[PDB]
């Protein structure tokens, strides 16, 4: 049983650690993208105002 | 069987690799969009001077 | 034990939920950025008319 | 053994199906983002040219 179930458990833990790093990276993308949207929409208002 | 457990563990390693590729995609998109924010800030400056 | 295997299976269900949340984040970002393309095309039209 | 190993296998298959849908969704984001970058950089050239 436990040879393979312990290595499988370890594999799942590693997968979960990778998932957390993916979550964190894509969160940074979302945060940057918010800024991009704001600055593009400001640029739109600026061009409209002239 | 132990063979079945081993197959599952190996399965999870490929999953980890695919998570890593997604993490790299979020990384690249974040850097691209952060640079684009800078371009848009330069665009705002250009428009204001005109 | 069977308990150990069950714990791993339940573990994978939470993983699926976290993958779904990432999928939703990519979905939202794609829609936002596709709309932003449209805004930028309108910006190009504004600038060309000026 | 196989009660729990079969449900764990099924759980992993479901997780993999979700991973594929995540990959596909984030690919669409990347494709849209390419267009956004191009159109912002065109807008930059247009503003520079006037």
| Whole-angstrom distance, CA of residue B26 vs CA of residue C24 | 14
In 3D space, the residue among B33, A44, B44 whose CA is nearest the CA of residue D36 turns out to be B33
Q: Evaluate whether C36 touches A37 at the Cβ level (below 8 Å).
A: yes
| Cβ within 8 Å, pair C32-A29 | no
Method for this entry: X-ray
| Cβ within 8 Å, pair C15-D14 | no
Tokens of D19: 């991973």
Domain that holds residue A11: 1-50
| Whole-angstrom distance, CA of residue B35 vs CA of residue B32 | 5
Q: What are phi and psi of D25, to 5 degrees?
A: -65, -45
| Cβ within 8 Å, pair D40-B40 | yes
* Chain A residues inside the 8 Å CB shell of C42: 44
How many distinct structural domains can be found in chain D?
Answer: 1
For residue B36, what is the nearest residue in chain A, using CA coordinates? Answer: A36
* Chain A residues inside the 8 Å CB shell of B33: 29, 32-33, 36
| Whole-angstrom distance, CA of residue C20 vs CA of residue D21 | 9
Measured in angstroms, the CA of C40 and the nearest CA of chain D are apart by: 7
């Amino acid at each position: 049983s436990q040879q393979q179930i312990a290595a499988l458990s370890e594999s799942l833990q590693a997968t979960q650690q990778q998932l957390q790093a993916l979550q964190q990276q894509c969160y940074e993308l979302e945060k940057t993208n918010r800024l991009l949207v704001s600055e593009v929409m400001t640029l739109q208002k600026m061009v409209k105002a002239q």
